[PDB]
Structure 1
Amino acid sequence: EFWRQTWSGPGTTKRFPETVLARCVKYTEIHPEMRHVDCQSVWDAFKGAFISKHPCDITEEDYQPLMKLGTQTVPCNKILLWSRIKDLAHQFTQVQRDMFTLEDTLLGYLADDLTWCGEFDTSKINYQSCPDWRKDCSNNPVSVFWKTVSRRFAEAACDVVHVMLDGSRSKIFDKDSTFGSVQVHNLQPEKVQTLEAWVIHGGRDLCQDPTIKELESIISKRNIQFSCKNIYRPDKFLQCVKNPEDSSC
């Protein structure tokens, strides 16, 4: 009973319902084009996807009603994907405002950095613990949400799709990541012309790393062109993105 926790992962973020709703209201303020959205209806559809459901039995179809309410057209040629480098990816698009990560969409913005799950056959949100993808089960409310939106976002991309990767990390490209397992394989060779990776540094040429060639090989088999660039000083990269007038760029 009370000393045991159902799951190995963090529980639902405190004030999750209030937070999702306040994020919806704020998003539709910052982004007028999405003001048709009823923030209450969005929350109801979000809640409906996982509440009373066993948190190891969530399906992509459970999120379909939410996907419909959060339908949004982003410019397909202005998409930035990323893996393991969320912070710089987000700061980039805070400055370069015509480019979008998933978290710059209504849906990604609502869910970013949050955890949520319900309990089997009750209407209570679980605030103690939620499944962990690796230790408990993969088909949980959080992982199934991200898989579904990450797929759709990738499918919508066109032209030169950019991906930010973490060069200071163990595996720069990881086939098992969300980017590697969901997004890479849902890039449409008809729409997408090129995938260009920006390998960021944290302290040589990293575009020759084995895993980068693995990625090169994978994208080539999909009949998309591959390109790669090092970013040797991410600090300077951001400064030059903020002020492209500056000469030392």
Structure 2
Amino acid sequence: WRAEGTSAHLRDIFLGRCAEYRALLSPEQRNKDCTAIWEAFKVALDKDPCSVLPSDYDLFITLSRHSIPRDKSLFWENSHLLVNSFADNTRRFMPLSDVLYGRVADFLSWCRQKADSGLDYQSCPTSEDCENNPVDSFWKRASIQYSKDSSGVIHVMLNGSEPTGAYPIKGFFADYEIPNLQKEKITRIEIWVMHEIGGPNVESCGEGSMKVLEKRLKDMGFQYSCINDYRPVKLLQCVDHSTHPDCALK
């Protein structure tokens, strides 16, 4: 397996994150059983590391699913850390990592040993090793759910400094979220194409892969919008480049 093995102390981390997230939920939907959620989740830890399907996580989703506030969904690509810091633990936006079923697995890795009941802390399969590995099947299932439950203004943060372009035609956003957006309950889609401070401007709104994305969203009937270096996020990037000319204040 050419990927990170199971995360040490997966269970404690999972339950801890789950318990802390409960506090963020509204009292009405605060009734969540972290233990049951973990049990449902571990069904994948009792299977062949190449025989886990997205549907295997259905129970896990049923037990953890909760509503996402209108206009708070934030999708992204090649911007993990920035998205998490900007979202600020649900305070500004609620990306998948800030939704219960996403929060418990953010950054973690897991898979059962090839031919032994115990978890494999040595390595886990990538899409290359095999399509149906625990981690990818999990995110496919969580992505679909996250997309289906989003409504209002859809925000998307992309990385215009990524060498392969801002929009990966083969990725979770393209293959599992866009096709699952409920057109009827979506007002518009606003894209933020961020560039590293002084970093390379590989692509901006309307260029390369951005034209492909825009065309698709438009052919799908969505009201489309694209902003280069959305200020609030630029200001956050600037925190680490205070003396740079792109970050100077008036």
Taking structure 1 as the reference length, the TM-score comes to 0.86
Q: Which residue of structure 2 aligns with residue 223 of structure 1?
A: 221
8 Å CA contact 2:192–2:230 kept in 1: the answer is no
Q: Which residue of structure 2 aligns with residue 106 of structure 1?
A: 100
Quick one: distance in 2 between partners of 1:226 and 1:237?
25
Quick one: distance in 1 between partners of 2:24 and 2:181?
29
Q: Which residue of structure 2 aligns with residue 87 of structure 1?
A: 81
Instruction: Give the letter for the 1:152 counterpart.
Output: Q
Q: Which residue of structure 1 aligns with residue 22 of structure 2?
A: 28
8 Å CA contact 1:52–1:122 kept in 2: the answer is no
Q: Which residue of structure 2 aligns with residue 47 of structure 1?
A: 42
Q: Which residue of structure 1 aligns with residue 143 of structure 2?
A: 150
Percent of residue pairs bearing the same amino acid type: 34
Say which SS state the counterpart of residue 130 (structure 1) adopts: coil
Instruction: Give the letter for the 1:225 counterpart.
Output: Q
The 3 A distance-change label for structure 1 pair 96 and 73 is closer
Quick one: distance in 2 between partners of 1:32 and 1:192?
23
Question: Structure 2: which 5+ residue stretches go unaligned?
Answer: 240-248
Match of 1:183 among 177, 182, 204: 177
Deviation at 1:46, TM superposition (A): 0.7
Instruction: Give the letter for the 1:146 counterpart.
Output: W
- Number of matched residues? 234
Match of 2:58 among 50, 58, 64: 64
8 Å CA contact 2:4–2:123 kept in 1: the answer is yes
Quick one: distance in 1 between partners of 2:180 and 2:26?
29
Is 1:140 the counterpart of 2:133? The answer is: yes
Instruction: Give the letter for the 2:222 counterpart.
Output: I
Quick one: distance in 2 between partners of 1:123 and 1:76?
42
Deviation at 1:52, TM superposition (A): 2.4
Taking structure 2 as the reference length, the TM-score comes to 0.86
Deviation at 1:232, TM superposition (A): 6.9
Quick one: distance in 2 between partners of 1:122 and 1:237?
46
Cα deviation, 1:177-229, whole Å, max 9, x if unaligned, reads 21122111211221113111000011278102121110011111211111100
Q: Which residue of structure 2 aligns with residue 164 of structure 1?
A: 157
Q: Which residue of structure 2 aligns with residue 74 of structure 1?
A: 68
Deviation at 1:92, TM superposition (A): 1.3
Question: Structure 1: which 5+ residue stretches go unaligned?
Answer: 1-6, 241-247
8 Å CA contact 1:52–1:120 kept in 2: the answer is no
Say which SS state the counterpart of residue 160 (structure 1) adopts: strand
Deviation at 1:71, TM superposition (A): 1.3
Quick one: distance in 2 between partners of 1:237 and 1:39?
33
8 Å CA contact 1:53–1:121 kept in 2: the answer is no
8 Å CA contact 2:47–2:112 kept in 1: the answer is yes
Quick one: distance in 2 between partners of 1:40 and 1:95?
22
Quick one: distance in 2 between partners of 1:229 and 1:51?
42
Deviation at 1:77, TM superposition (A): 2.0
Quick one: distance in 2 between partners of 1:188 and 1:148?
16
Runs of 4+ in 1 over 6 A off after TM superposition: none
8 Å CA contact 2:206–2:214 kept in 1: the answer is no
Say which SS state the counterpart of residue 71 (structure 2) adopts: helix
Match of 2:192 among 191, 198, 223: 198
Deviation at 1:133, TM superposition (A): 1.6
